[PDB]
Symmetry: D2
């Protein structure tokens, strides 16, 4: 098994970089009732500071237009939709990790598009027109929300320009130019606004080295580096879904650690580094996302990810998505932490559990994190992800946890194949694509962790915990100080109740 | 164990008389935010039709007042509070099972009072004035709610008049006179208004014989007989609480059965019989009410009480109560199905579980009830009350349930000593009297039945249910047809996901 | 002025056909938070039973798709969105007046499209697949909401086929076929499902005749005739808006009266007549919709339309629209009764005012309507639209209304250029395109009718009302019985208060 | 009329001391639903920082109890209720201006009580037991809310001890002893908790000179001086209401000033001064509270009171009151800014209007206040209370206001006998005591100020306002820069709309 004696002291800190940002489907979808109810719901449980998605300039949001009169053609920047979208974000208490893109059609130099909703991925016909659009939007943001607010919004230029699907011909140089023109337009508005990139996907880090060298040699400002991370191997789509083998979380933490080094060996060694999008599979139709395995797996990344990066946004917070058309079933492998109808997937609870962690990191290994909060209470999280099939997926634990107080109240939350696994149940129901309200209700009741309370006696400043982790289980223990008030109950004696 | 083969048909039906009416603390408390929130919470889970409680005429509600102009004394009827209370009841979707009482101070003949809030319990100094009061109030309900709504309200006269604590000297003669004047006044406003009594507690059923014969020989209107029922032996209060031995459910059931028989053998053999108030203990400070035990014990009463009475009102719906002063801790043995801070007790889920029962009663025995719904689905409810210390409380079950389909989706809900037991957690916390918001949150999360789902196949029209019931457990099983859609998912194969 | 003595009684009735249905932007938009909040807000004030809009089969809702397996093209029906859309409707208490259309891209024969959102308007490439899509959809509805529910939904086939914009070549022949097939496939699902058409716009009434003869001769089912009505003359769009002279309401009423005759003269003389879409201007950018004029104008139609049709649906209920792109300002001449940010336009209150109408019509002329409600109270609505430019816009009135009671309470509500005119205030602010929260709040405070109360003593069963209507005003007078309680207050005397 | 030229200059500030605190009925009522919804309502409209009322220790809240075990009698402090009350207050965002009192029954030395709810007005039998109570309560507050939070709560000792009705025999010396014991108990808990008194009503300011002198001689700590002020003369109660002449606001403002000077000449010259209770009439049944008069009257105090005091709390925020038994009609002369059923009274809008004032005072006199906000926009409030019967009550105005912009947007709000006067409408209904839902709805609709917008151009930095103030009217004018966007609407032209 795994015997562990948690140190009573430690000089390691656990930050909340894991909850800095969360991803989302294109901004246009944010106008949806379903989208907003779910965002509010997530924010009532996980305090994400930012939310990052594509589509700010896409035509459904409808910002860039052009009015034609016999005499001239002049641009018209329409803010009716983003005002509403950004107004609701600020109301909910979350800020946009703005992504500049994609190319509105009236400015497109080409016709290439991406996804079901067809965002244009070609450079602008006229870079100056693109520069004025960016400034027009920035000035509108300042006008409506004030410069103090907007200055907190980082601006990421484009998305995965290294892939021919998001950027015409994967033209590295044209990207650097787009970045230059955009960065200059933003800075012109206000020199303190944060700009960055290159928002590339893995397997092309020579882009980050080039990107940084370009900003250096061309004297172009950069306030942060962005990149994406996935651990899913190549797969084969069916007209409904796709399966991909997920490599261990080790490969992702290593990619983090690797690109971090590239930034420190570059001309801008202290640049903050954001993983603006990550998950196991990079497909919005891969079943693994809705499983308990996904939640046990992500656990470690939330545990160690912050050691190498400034943030890492989980893609996504909801199944309200469309890159591959409208979802066709209650569970379809969406990126969402929360499935449609506000049904939290196990992964949702992994994030929820980390909300209990303190800054003092007493102990940590590849399958367990132990911290202490301000008040002195101790929280512990352990996970048991099953990478491949086996007959011994169980793992026993015995941990000695240091505790200030003598009397302890214990609160244990758990999720695994039988607890907080709405997916398994949906399978019991016959995988309905469009369940009834009664069925969705049963899925909500099921989608909750198991809660168990107890009390022990901490001896010489320590408490011994023994537990077993089933297949793909994630557990959260909280040890707070118990202050017994039983003596104040005159005549208290439970044994005088029938059977106790 | 307990092997049972449930029949395909039966000549028995199961009514919903078990949810006709529920009890409440004095009406004046309906003015509380805590009270209304809680009532709305119960109604969202249990479709109670009526709500029965004391205090309609008590001075906190303030209906009866007297204005003095010189040496003249004119009465004044203030409807400000009742209007707000009854307005809030009808808005929530529940009607009052009116209880005419107690005695307004200005109309009292003596000074004897009952409870911490001192409801005067002496007859009126002038039965005329009392009669006018009764008529003034009804004409107001009529005037504000319309005769059509008020005709749906029954009017029970007084409360347990056979006890000297609730009616001076337990004067049976004066009560019969009280009843005559009151019933007469009611009928005069509108003879369709249901009036009844005698509202006595157990151990004095001769009071009913005397009552009925009093009406049958005095031609006094009577639309229903009401009585209370408990199974708790005399106990001895401590300044904080009291314990009492609770007897088996048989006693209460046989009591329902006895009195029901005292009526069929009466001069009004067809009068409806209402148990306007029941529970294990008749004390608002008996810890037994907050236990899983209570939940299991009342389960059988819901299953059979309907056979003998037109309705039985569990006392009460909430711990918002003040008979023995303001509650002094999160759990204090109050009558409520719901503890303060809207924390449902296990008995709450016993009622909740019965909502799954259909009208077709296929099988039933002292510890189990099986029914079929309109759509063919079948539901089962078993309970295991452990009425005494025992090294072994567990019970084994094996039930063959007839099902008109082969593929079955199973939804199981369980409450016992480790599930849906906020009381057990409260103790784990050191029995906090005034718990913080985090504690109350923990209690709320624990206070939920364990939901568990599965899917098996039926053989020879029978689905075999094998399960054991732990200490004081209550389980719900709903078996519905599983209509599998798994075939419409192209490429579907969970084995292609890590570990699966 | 206009002196009118309202007849003591009458045998004519005012029906609520005016509130039977209301229009809406494309169904896909019903997914919007703004849409839903607005629909609920409307339904709390005006009880519309049905809602009519296009886009049911348009690809944004996404019902029709095609899976490519190997070399076989299998059709797929995705209900994720209409299920969410129709649930919200039914949840709110409003049913869809279904409109079958337009052509999903995959089944489209041509490439022609209409509107900013490109709804394909060509016939199907295979009328078989069309019929199968139709039955697939209907069955699902049946399966999800039950046949008893789906039976209450009428089915309109396509939209204004008599116009090249919505139907390729306005081919009258094809429409009759598409209708034959569609009206058939529906019936095959269930013979009681109401079907109708041709839902043409005014001017081409020859279509209704050729339609009612097509059915008769080719033996095609028909349960209703649908047509649209508009009184706006042609105009010339600027890239932002359009102005159009609006003809008098008389033109519209005459058309209702006309087309209704064509039906009573046809083979189907008892067919119901539905005006599934009407308003002054048929453009979503004609400022007239946002004005006090548009409200005093529509008053007379809500007042008389019912005399000729089974229903007439105001297009639309909200400015949440996109036919001509995303709106570019708080007021942009949208069809809505309610402007974005839930700001009611004066027309909204014209409908609202009609709720006060009883069924007993005592009087009515081109500018007034007086009805008596069941309880006896009387209600009056008078409107003064200013059609052209004049220098004497105001109108004086003197109406003797028959009043059952002797003491009257008068509640007067009024809207005009100075009251309930958020548009005028919007102008005072400088016509802001994207108003701040404070400005929207001011618009909301302003967007309400003026309210005045008073009290008169009816003499000889009649009450004399002298009022003055300003430019484009619409007023509501409710006359309920006044039962004075002042005498029950001992010492009551306002003169004993400073200055009274 | 009155002609005023507001100087474009400011040497004095206008603070928000007017909204520092508001009054309330006894704490035990804070448990009512009506109460809380109303407190939330008021807070959404006025940012009151504190709320001050009686009954913290009274027995309905029930903190002080005594358990009798055998012979030994042990005190028990039950926090169930205040915990709920103060939880609700902090949740809403308003802190308690704690008033220690009255005397719990079991600790009383005498039998004298005050008000319908009978709060005990005699000194404690044992000052040590009272001292322990104070400590227990404070220690609990710290335990539940944290020290940082409780340190912001001021502690006023008792209420109007100078009156025989609230303090047995108006024993000045016994009150100073009560203050010392209490203050010392408070300071024992925490040295920096704010304590003060004497909370006397007018006419006995020597209690104040004696109070400060007592604290000096006995070295008893004191942090503030509290006092009450009313301007109603003697009246003669009827069993239902009371009338009293209200003296000019000058009287009250001069009392604030007189007492302020007394504190300055004491041993503690810099002590803050709080008027913990004020209004016109001090009776919870004097109709003046509900009239427009009261609104125009209070206007001047809100305007000048902050000049002499650190706060002045209007008694009360809501009609939820019981001092003189449960209210008996929709309007009854309650102290509330808001009447039952959340119907704001005119005074409510006087406070609401003051939210508009900025810190820069530009002009002020007995009937007008003009200030400038931080963004440069200007606000003006003028009032015209009619102190006595008159045929000529109106008051005309011409005010020249300086504005830094040329294009001005004007928002004007007005309450008077005809606008926002629910009392007036209520009378029109016959003065119903228990209005129907419909009538309550009509009053709510009337209970709003008249809103009117417009736009003028200033001439040489000045805008001229011309208006007439009706009887008891209060007007608010907000002038903000008008930034016209009309030029961006291509083809805009309202004249192209029928009648425009
Ligand atoms: C990163 O990979 C996942 C995909 O859904 C995102 O759109 C892309 F940016
Ligand atoms: C019935 O017993 C319980 C008690 O609380 C009730 O008041 C009584 F009527
Ligand atoms: C009827 O005219 C108005 C337009 O918006 C609709 O689309 C059309 F059917
Ligand atoms: C001050 O006068 C008004 C009364 O209602 C308060 O109780 C008193 F303190």
């Amino acid at each position: 098994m795994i015997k562990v004696r948690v140190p009573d002291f430690s000089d390691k800190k656990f930050s909340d970089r894991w909850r800095y940002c969360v991803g989302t489907g294109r901004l246009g979808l944010a106008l949806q009732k379903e989208y907003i109810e779910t965002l509010k719901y997530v924010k009532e449980n996980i305090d994400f500071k930012y939310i990052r998605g594509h589509g700010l300039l896409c035509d459904d949001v409808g910002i860039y237009r052009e009015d034609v009169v016999g005499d001239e053609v002049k641009p018209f920047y329409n803010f009716t939709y983003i005002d509403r979208i950004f107004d609701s974000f600020l109301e909910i208490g979350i800020r946009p990790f703005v992504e500049i893109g994609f190319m509105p059609k009236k400015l497109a130099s080409g016709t290439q598009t991406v996804f079901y909703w067809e965002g244009n991925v070609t450079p602008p016909k006229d870079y100056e027109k693109w520069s004025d659009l960016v400034k027009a939007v920035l000035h509108h943001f300042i006008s409506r929300y004030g410069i103090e607010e907007v200055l907190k919004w980082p601006f990421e230029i484009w998305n995965e320009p290294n892939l021919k699907e998001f950027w015409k011909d994967a033209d590295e140089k044209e990207y650097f130019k787009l970045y230059k023109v955009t960065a200059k337009a933003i800075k012109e508005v206000n020199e303190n606004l944060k700009v960055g990139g290159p928002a590339i996907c893995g397997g092309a880090d020579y882009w980050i080295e080039d990107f940084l060298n370009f900003c250096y040699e061309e004297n172009v400002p950069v306030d942060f580096v962005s990149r994406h991370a996935y651990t899913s191997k190549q797969g084969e789509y069916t007209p409904h879904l796709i399966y991909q083998e997920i490599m261990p979380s080790e490969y992702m933490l290593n990619e983090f650690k690797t690109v971090r080094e590239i930034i420190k060996n570059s001309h801008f060694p202290n640049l903050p580094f954001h993983i603006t999008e990550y998950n196991t599979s990079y497909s919005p139709q891969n079943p693994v996302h809705d499983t308990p395995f996904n939640a046990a797996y992500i656990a470690r990344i939330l545990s160690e990810g912050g050691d190498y990066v400034d943030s890492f946004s989980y893609w996504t917070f909801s199944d309200v998505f469309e890159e591959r058309d409208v979802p066709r079933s209650q569970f379809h492998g969406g990126f969402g932490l929360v499935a449609l109808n506000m049904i939290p997937k196990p992964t949702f609870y992994t994030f929820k559990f980390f909300n209990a962690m303190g800054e003092e990191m007493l102990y940590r290994d590849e399958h367990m994190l132990v911290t202490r909060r301000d008040d002195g209470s101790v929280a512990l999280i352990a996970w048991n992800e099953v990478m491949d099939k086996t007959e011994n997926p169980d793992e026993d634990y015995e941990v000695e946890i240091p505790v200030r107080f003598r009397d302890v109240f214990i609160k244990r939350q758990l999720i695994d194949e039988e607890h907080g696994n709405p997916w398994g149940t949906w399978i019991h129901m016959g995988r309905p694509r469009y369940p009834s309200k009664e069925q969705v209700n049963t899925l909500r009741e099921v989608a909750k962790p198991e809660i168990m309370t107890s009390q022990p006696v901490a001896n010489d400043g320590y408490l011994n915990l023994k537990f077993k982790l089933g297949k793909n289980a994630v557990v959260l223990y909280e040890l707070t100080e118990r202050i017994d008030e039983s003596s104040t109950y005159i005549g208290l004696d439970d044994s005088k109740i029938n059977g106790y």
